[PDB]
Design brief:
It is classed as immune system. The structure holds 2 chains of a larger assembly. Chain A is mostly beta strands. Chain A folds into 2 domains: about 110 residues, Immunoglobulins (Immunoglobulin-like, Sandwich); about 100 residues, Immunoglobulin-like (Sandwich). Helices cover about 5% and strands about 45% of the residues of chain A. In chain A, the strands form 4 sheets. In chain A, strands 1, 3, 4, 7, 8 and 9 form a 6-stranded mixed sheet that branches. Chain A starts with 8 loop residues before the first strand and ends in a 6-residue tail after the last strand. Chains A and B meet through β10, β11, β13, β14 and β15 of A and α1, β10, β12 and β13 of B.
């Protein structure tokens, strides 16, 4: 056999909806009443949301409703509400106590509003300085979509080195959470004027600066 | 619901045998004894590689072994092979609709030396308090491999609200970064004796604490 087919992509638009097919062979979907559907945000753990099609459990939101029609297994994600951007899968039973999956449906939600990020720059703490290190981090939070860039300024002749940006991760909200750090010697921190992290996010550039005369 | 605990990293060479466990974060066993192991490779089919604690489905090899202890269900990849690299998960069943999934695991074949995180927690800058909001930022760096646990504490109190963990990036050193932020209610930041960012990585659990002041 194989893995009971799932459409590689799907699109709703908040308020609108989306229905996901789980097409299989007559010995699995439509054969036993044992279709299940799962939810997966970037690893985490999958969360069973549907076990013998039909029904949703109370630790699942009610707009998740699934039904099979002959061999078309389907799941409606009604009224579409964005948070459910996710990578799903589907299952049903085969033979000797064995279960096969759908090949996953990447899913989205259109109409999510764009957001330019809060750039919250941090001067090194005292404890760091007391160990002889001097790391500066730029928290880049709550931007949609995840197209951001990060540049560092030591002043104007800019930091080429030491910089470590991150590829934007997933918030509990389809807004993204990146960070960008600099590793300095104190003998380099104080021997400066002001450092900045400049954050570019489509339309805007958003800078945060910091002076070696910070508090602690 | 939710309540099973599975380790961040899992790793070996080739040849090397790796055990992955999963402990029940509340009373289950006595109750349920039919737990399940799911292998997920990067962008493909979650395949149940163990059914009901030890039974190997058709297809599965034998250097895959399910077992328990008492609250820990465990799998054992007793002869490591390159396409062993993946994202195992553990699973469960409670009431009708009550299927509990572990938080996941990564199995890495080491083709690089091990590197434990380098935690550097940053307390809210003076200026940011001046802007009436408080954000601690836990920073994890220089580790291998890119799978790690993060936890936050406000005087013991394992607090979950306000955390957000970014996923591991490869830094330009073949080691990973990661970063957990916490956007606090600034007074609530006054009124706590300490704050701890905790990072679990295979064989090492580092706890980094911070206490407040109102400087300058």
């Amino acid at each position: 056999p194989s893995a009971l087919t799932q459409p590689p992509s799907a699109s709703g638009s908040l308020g609108q909806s989306v229905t996901i097919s789980c097409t299989g062979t007559s010995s699995d979907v439509g054969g036993y009443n044992y279709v299940s559907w799962y939810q997966q945000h970037a690893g985490k753990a999958p969360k069973v949301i549907i076990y013998e099609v039909n029904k949703r459990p109370s630790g699942v939101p009610d707009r998740f409703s699934g039904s099979k029609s002959g061999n078309t297994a389907s799941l409606t994600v009604s009224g579409l509400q964005a948070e459910d951007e996710a990578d799903y899968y589907c299952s049903s039973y085969e033979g000797s106590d064995n279960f096969v999956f759908g090949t996953g449906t990447k899913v989205t939600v259109l109409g999510q509003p764009k957001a330019n990020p809060t750039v919250t720059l941090f001067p090194p703490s005292s404890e760091e300085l007391q160990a002889n290190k001097a790391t500066l981090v730029c928290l880049i939070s709550d931007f949609y979509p995840g197209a951001v860039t990060v540049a560092w300024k030591a002043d104007g002749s800019p930091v080429k080195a030491g910089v470590e940006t991150t590829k934007p991760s997933k918030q509990s909200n389809n807004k993204y959470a990146a960070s960008s750090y600099l590793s300095l010697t104190p003998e380099q921190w104080k021997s400066h004027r002001s450092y900045s992290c400049q954050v570019t996010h489509e339309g805007s550039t958003v800078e945060k600066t910091v002076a070696p005369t910070e508090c602690s």
